[PDB]
Design an enzyme around this catalytic site. Structure first.
Site, PDB file in Angstrom:
ATOM      1  N   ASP A 210       0.594  -1.397  -0.587  1.00 39.61           N
ATOM      2  CA  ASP A 210       0.123   0.111   0.053  1.00 39.61           C
ATOM      3  C   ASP A 210       1.123   1.123   0.448  1.00 39.61           C
ATOM      4  O   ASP A 210       0.972   1.674   0.848  1.00 39.61           O
ATOM      5  CB  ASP A 210      -1.428   0.356   1.139  1.00 39.61           C
ATOM      6  N   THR A 211       0.690   1.461  -1.148  1.00 40.67           N
ATOM      7  CA  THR A 211       0.962   3.062  -1.219  1.00 40.67           C
ATOM      8  C   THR A 211       1.228   4.193  -0.374  1.00 40.67           C
ATOM      9  O   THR A 211       1.462   5.475  -0.543  1.00 40.67           O
ATOM     10  CB  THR A 211       2.571   2.906  -2.872  1.00 40.67           C
ATOM     11  N   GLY A 212      -0.354   4.298  -0.446  1.00 35.14           N
ATOM     12  CA  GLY A 212      -0.552   5.212   0.189  1.00 35.14           C
ATOM     13  C   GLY A 212      -1.231   5.239   1.837  1.00 35.14           C
ATOM     14  O   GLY A 212      -1.156   5.716   2.557  1.00 35.14           O
TER      15      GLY A 212
HETATM   16  C1  LIG Z   1      -7.410   7.748   2.610  1.00 29.68           C
HETATM   17  C2  LIG Z   1      -7.386   6.280   3.276  1.00 29.68           C
HETATM   18  C3  LIG Z   1      -5.408   6.356   2.948  1.00 29.68           C
HETATM   19  C4  LIG Z   1      -4.604   8.118   2.599  1.00 29.68           C
HETATM   20  C5  LIG Z   1      -5.148   9.101   4.305  1.00 29.68           C
HETATM   21  C6  LIG Z   1      -4.526   5.971   3.913  1.00 29.68           C
HETATM   22  N1  LIG Z   1      -5.506   4.486   4.150  1.00 29.68           N
HETATM   23  C7  LIG Z   1      -4.001   3.061   3.054  1.00 29.68           C
HETATM   24  C8  LIG Z   1      -5.417   3.277   1.981  1.00 29.68           C
HETATM   25  O1  LIG Z   1      -4.303   2.181   0.933  1.00 29.68           O
HETATM   26  C9  LIG Z   1      -6.560   2.268   2.361  1.00 29.68           C
HETATM   27  C10 LIG Z   1      -5.342   0.472   2.919  1.00 29.68           C
HETATM   28  C11 LIG Z   1      -7.184   0.006   3.394  1.00 29.68           C
HETATM   29  C12 LIG Z   1      -7.869  -0.354   2.328  1.00 29.68           C
HETATM   30  C13 LIG Z   1      -9.376  -1.499   2.392  1.00 29.68           C
HETATM   31  C14 LIG Z   1      -9.812  -1.635   3.385  1.00 29.68           C
HETATM   32  C15 LIG Z   1      -9.412  -0.614   4.477  1.00 29.68           C
HETATM   33  C16 LIG Z   1      -8.170   0.320   4.574  1.00 29.68           C
HETATM   34  N2  LIG Z   1      -7.383   2.262   0.910  1.00 29.68           N
HETATM   35  C17 LIG Z   1      -8.513   2.776   1.080  1.00 29.68           C
HETATM   36  O2  LIG Z   1      -9.321   3.299   2.035  1.00 29.68           O
HETATM   37  O3  LIG Z   1      -8.909   3.278   0.076  1.00 29.68           O
HETATM   38  C18 LIG Z   1     -10.758   3.728  -0.400  1.00 29.68           C
HETATM   39  C19 LIG Z   1     -10.646   3.387  -0.922  1.00 29.68           C
HETATM   40  O4  LIG Z   1     -10.713   2.610  -2.722  1.00 29.68           O
HETATM   41  C20 LIG Z   1     -11.832   1.554  -1.631  1.00 29.68           C
HETATM   42  O5  LIG Z   1     -11.129  -0.219  -1.708  1.00 29.68           O
HETATM   43  C21 LIG Z   1     -10.190   0.095  -0.415  1.00 29.68           C
HETATM   44  C22 LIG Z   1     -11.668   0.677   0.052  1.00 29.68           C
HETATM   45  C23 LIG Z   1     -12.044   1.472  -0.010  1.00 29.68           C
HETATM   46  S1  LIG Z   1      -5.554   3.806   5.572  1.00 29.68           S
HETATM   47  O6  LIG Z   1      -5.341   2.040   5.567  1.00 29.68           O
HETATM   48  O7  LIG Z   1      -6.770   4.154   5.881  1.00 29.68           O
HETATM   49  C24 LIG Z   1      -4.389   3.666   6.441  1.00 29.68           C
HETATM   50  C25 LIG Z   1      -4.151   5.483   7.369  1.00 29.68           C
HETATM   51  C26 LIG Z   1      -2.994   6.019   7.866  1.00 29.68           C
HETATM   52  C27 LIG Z   1      -1.813   5.123   8.506  1.00 29.68           C
HETATM   53  C28 LIG Z   1      -0.808   5.660   9.224  1.00 29.68           C
HETATM   54  O8  LIG Z   1       0.230   5.926   8.673  1.00 29.68           O
HETATM   55  C29 LIG Z   1      -0.265   4.928  10.862  1.00 29.68           C
HETATM   56  O9  LIG Z   1       0.315   6.051  11.279  1.00 29.68           O
HETATM   57  C30 LIG Z   1      -1.750   3.875   7.653  1.00 29.68           C
HETATM   58  C31 LIG Z   1      -2.665   3.374   6.676  1.00 29.68           C
END
Ligand SMILES: CCC(CC)CN(C[C@@H](O)[C@H](Cc1ccccc1)NC(=O)O[C@H]1CO[C@H]2OCC[C@H]21)S(=O)(=O)c1ccc([C@H](O)CO)cc1
Lengths: 99, 99
Positions: free
Chosen positions: A25-27
């Site tokens: 996850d690059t995000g």
């Molecule tokens: C906008 C959120 C991103 C940017 C702030 C950050 N995120 C990573 C994304 O890649 C997430 C990964 C993910 C995939 C599936 C379920 C839950 C999470 N993908 C995702 O939300 O995608 C949306 C859209 O597309 C759809 O498919 C997937 C779900 C739907 S995060 O997980 O929330 C995260 C927050 C804080 C930290 C700090 O580094 C820690 O300290 C590390 C990780």
């Protein structure tokens, strides 16, 4: 290898002596893993994304193996729906985006 | 280009004639942008993240240029913490992970 993005970039990882599936996850700045009872000390932390925040436990200097590539860094453990390999470990395995 | 991950993979995008900064997010299935005005019709949709589910406006077949590469696909608009480019558009610009 080269991973296309038609489907989720899920790979097998090894942490705490256990095999798991996780996203490259690059995000994500940091690595977030599903609830698991790791040994050692930890620090509470809250992390935010779509939908809001979840409470996690921050473990430092955790060894993870991703597709045979070894890495060691911070791992956040909590009620995440998916195991997330973040940039803190992706850099250690030499992972890049290319287009 | 080849993008290393020691910093956030932020890029400039062009959508609806306006420039914005967005995050290349291989862990996102879909593209989600912060609240904005976009021309055309839209449908109410739901999407879930690490912290739960949010309501978004779904715009289909939207022209969006990412770091000079053109894509035409679905764009979701709602209270996401940051603008994210998901796999639905990363595939269009030919983006892959490599290590
Ligand atoms: C906008 C959120 C991103 C940017 C702030 C950050 N995120 C990573 C994304 O890649 C997430 C990964 C993910 C995939 C599936 C379920 C839950 C999470 N993908 C995702 O939300 O995608 C949306 C859209 O597309 C759809 O498919 C997937 C779900 C739907 S995060 O997980 O929330 C995260 C927050 C804080 C930290 C700090 O580094 C820690 O300290 C590390 C990780």
């Amino acid at each position: 290898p080269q991973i296309t993005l038609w489907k989720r970039p899920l790979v097998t990882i090894k942490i705490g002596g256990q095999l798991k599936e996780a996203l490259l996850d690059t995000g994500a700045d940091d690595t977030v893993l599903e609830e698991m009872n790791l040994p050692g000390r930890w620090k509470p932390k809250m992390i935010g994304g779509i939908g809001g925040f979840i409470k996690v436990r921050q473990y430092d200097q955790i060894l993870i193996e991703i597709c045979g590539h070894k890495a060691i860094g911070t791992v956040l453990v909590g009620p995440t729906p998916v195991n997330i390999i973040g940039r803190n470990l992706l850099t250690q395995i030499g992972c890049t985006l290319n287009f």
